Design an enzyme around this catalytic site. Structure first.
Site, mmCIF file in Angstrom:
data_model
loop_
_atom_site.group_PDB
_atom_site.id
_atom_site.type_symbol
_atom_site.label_atom_id
_atom_site.label_comp_id
_atom_site.label_asym_id
_atom_site.label_seq_id
_atom_site.Cartn_x
_atom_site.Cartn_y
_atom_site.Cartn_z
ATOM 1 N N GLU A 35 171.597 76.469 4.705
ATOM 2 C CA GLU A 35 171.235 77.234 5.436
ATOM 3 C C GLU A 35 172.172 77.872 7.038
ATOM 4 O OE1 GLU A 35 168.017 77.076 5.967
ATOM 5 O OE2 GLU A 35 167.305 75.445 5.005
ATOM 6 N N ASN A 46 162.431 84.897 11.895
ATOM 7 C CA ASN A 46 161.412 84.926 10.696
ATOM 8 C C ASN A 46 160.614 86.429 11.277
ATOM 9 O OD1 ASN A 46 161.796 80.838 10.833
ATOM 10 N ND2 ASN A 46 162.832 83.290 9.373
ATOM 11 N N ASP A 48 157.425 86.171 11.063
ATOM 12 C CA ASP A 48 155.691 85.543 12.056
ATOM 13 C C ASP A 48 156.793 85.353 13.434
ATOM 14 O OD1 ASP A 48 157.704 82.938 12.290
ATOM 15 O OD2 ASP A 48 156.581 81.680 12.010
ATOM 16 N N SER A 50 158.965 83.684 14.797
ATOM 17 C CA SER A 50 159.749 82.466 14.949
ATOM 18 C C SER A 50 161.225 82.417 14.536
ATOM 19 C CB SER A 50 159.308 81.156 14.362
ATOM 20 O OG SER A 50 159.376 81.095 12.918
ATOM 21 N N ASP A 52 164.842 80.529 13.021
ATOM 22 C CA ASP A 52 165.500 78.928 12.637
ATOM 23 C C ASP A 52 166.673 78.962 13.291
ATOM 24 O OD1 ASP A 52 163.507 79.046 10.836
ATOM 25 O OD2 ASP A 52 165.004 80.061 9.452
ATOM 26 N N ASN A 59 163.085 75.515 12.611
ATOM 27 C CA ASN A 59 161.930 76.437 13.245
ATOM 28 C C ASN A 59 161.018 76.308 14.373
ATOM 29 O OD1 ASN A 59 159.392 78.053 12.917
ATOM 30 N ND2 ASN A 59 160.872 78.854 12.148
ATOM 31 N N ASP A 101 158.310 63.830 7.937
ATOM 32 C CA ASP A 101 156.955 64.507 8.176
ATOM 33 C C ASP A 101 156.460 64.339 7.149
ATOM 34 O OD1 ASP A 101 157.573 67.386 6.930
ATOM 35 O OD2 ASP A 101 157.100 68.117 8.725
#
Ligand code: CL
Ligand code: CL
Ligand code: NA
Ligand code: NA
EC number: 3.2.1.17
Length: 129
Positions: A35, A46, A48, A50, A52, A59, A101
């Site tokens: 990562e 990203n 979208d 967003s 990281d 994120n 989650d």
């Protein structure tokens, strides 16, 4: 900060990640390697909108507030910039919420693609833990 492999394993172990929700330490080291290349300051944007953040590239769409991801949640209740600190505490605690989650470490695409099903214990081999 750019961690050493063994140094990060050690830090993650101290913070309770070793076998957290069944994931051995090597999983977490492997994920951090791919990562972020063990750099706490890593960011990546990203498609979208967003971003990281940090060693585990958490994120901003769901997990932290960066003030620029419209319509997003802040489920770890932290500013995303706290994930960039040389103290991994905030990254580690938020990761524990994420991995709990429902999807386990599949939430980290790099883990799924680069770590899952590999010999992850190789990532902690040779380390004094
Ligand atoms: Cl936002
Ligand atoms: Cl990947
Ligand atoms: Na992180
Ligand atoms: Na957010």
């Amino acid at each position: 900060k750019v961690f050493g492999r063994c140094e990060l394993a050690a830090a993650m172990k101290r913070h309770g990640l070793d076998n957290y929700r069944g994931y051995s330490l090597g999983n977490w080291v492997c994920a951090a390697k791919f990562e972020s290349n063990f750099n706490t300051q890593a960011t990546n944007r990203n498609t979208d909108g967003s971003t990281d953040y940090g060693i585990l590239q958490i994120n901003s769409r769901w997990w932290c507030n960066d003030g620029r991801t419209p319509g997003s949640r802040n489920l770890c209740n932290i500013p995303c910039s706290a994930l960039l600190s040389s103290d991994i505490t905030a990254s580690v605690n938020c990761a524990k919420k994420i991995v709990s989650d429902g999807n386990g470490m599949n939430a980290w695409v790099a883990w799924r693609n680069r770590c899952k099903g590999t010999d992850v214990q190789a990532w902690i081999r040779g380390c004094r833990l």
